[PDB]
Paper text:
EPDR1 is a member of the ependymin-related (EPDR) family of proteins. The crystal structure confirms that EPDR1 adopts the highly curved β-sheet fold that had been previously observed only in bacterial proteins. Two EPDR1 chains associate into a tight homodimer through extensive hydrophilic contacts between the convex surfaces of shelf-II. At acidic pH, EPDR1 can bind to liposomes that contain the anionic lipid bis-monoacylglycero-phosphate (BMP) or the ganglioside GM1, consistent with a role in the degradation or transport of lipids and/or lipoproteins within the lysosome.
We solved the deglycosylated form by Se-Met SAD phasing and used this structure to solve the glycosylated form by molecular replacement. Deglycosylated EPDR1 crystallized in a different packing arrangement with two independent homodimers per asymmetric unit. All three of the crystallographically independent EPDR1 homodimers (one dimer from crystals of the glycosylated protein, and two dimers from crystals of the deglycosylated protein) are similar to each other with Cα RSMDs less than 0.6 Å, indicating little variability within the chains and across the homodimer interface. The main difference between the structures from the two crystal forms is that no ligands were observed within the pockets in any of the deglycosylated structures, and we refer to the deglycosylated structures as apo-EPDR1. In addition to the empty ligand pockets, the loops at the mouth of the groove of apo-EPDR1 had weaker electron density. This is reflected in the higher atomic displacement parameters for loops L6 and L7, while L9, L4 and the C-terminal half of L12 (the latter two are linked by a disulfide bond between residues C88 and C222) could not be traced at all. We suggest that the ridge that lines the opening to the ligand groove is dynamic and flexible in apo-EPDR1 and becomes more ordered upon the binding of a ligand.
Numbering used by the authors:
A (entry chain B): 39 to 81, 91 to 156, 160 to 211
B (entry chain A): 38 to 83, 90 to 155, 160 to 214
């Protein structure tokens, strides 16, 4: 069992759980791993994260008032690293209609990442970050379509200067 | 709106259950028998317990895999099947994965102050995930996989003889 190659360019939607708030938040997701840029649209904000630059933008969907700020965090792609240990492979659904998926744990320096990806074509289904086994942040992805249909989603409005 | 699917009421597979108090995921095998309202779960290493929940008899047993000490205590709360109640509000329909390798699923919220929200398959109504949340805190959530219908040998639900003597 060798890690697959997740698509580095796709659009879909996500449900993100945070333990601090303890909540799930649904949003659309534009993931561009080639340009290391990602934009999420709340389903009330829109966020545009440009990692090649040092900047992220937070936009009121109604107001367009834009707050720009240094990104701080380093880039972490939505794929399974080569040095990640294989944990399990299971099937979601059941007999007459199933996905086979696999689960991987990178354990990046006691913070550990654990991601579940589809087996043959490797769309991301879920990603979970956990500190000392206390699940800090988890996200599920669905309706994935490869590539970006309109890259203007990553260009900030003129409100952000 | 669409009409709820009726999930199979007898199947066995595996689960990972996340609990907000501990904040942890726990993997285990699961034998779900909704017809006899009995369910048995077997902890997986990834203090290793086995739980047998018999709702018709109102009794639950936790049995411990290493030593087989069984503790029997009365089942407090009522039975709730792994299906979508009829008065569930429909939330969304999704696709997991991508082209040629995917499943279409739907998410339902019954909201039986407590809210239940579970996502089940569209075409065959296999359960994929169950979530219980109090006032927007995720309290509990469990994901199911490797489901095969029916129960292979119902003896999975008979407690060990250590459990008969227990109090």
């Amino acid at each position: 069992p060798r890690p697959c190659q997740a698509p580095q360019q796709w659009e879909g939607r996500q449900v993100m759980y945070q333990q601090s708030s303890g909540r799930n938040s649904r949003a659309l997701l534009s993931y561009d791993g080639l340009n290391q840029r990602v934009r999420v649209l709340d389903e009330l904000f829109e966020y545009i994260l440009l990692y090649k630059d040092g900047v992220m933008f937070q936009i009121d969907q109604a107001t367009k008032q834009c707050s720009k700020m240094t990104l701080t965090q380093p880039w972490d792609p939505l794929d399974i690293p080569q040095n990640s240990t294989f944990e399990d492979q299971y099937s979601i659904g059941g007999p007459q209609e199933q996905i086979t998926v696999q689960e991987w744990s990178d354990r990046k320096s006691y913070e550990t990442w654990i991601g579940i990806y589809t087996v043959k074509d490797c769309y991301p289904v879920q990603e979970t970050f956990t500190i000392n086994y206390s699940v800090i942040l988890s996200t599920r992805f669905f309706d994935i379509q490869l590539g970006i249909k309109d890259p203007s989603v990553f260009t900030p409005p003129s409100t952000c200067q």
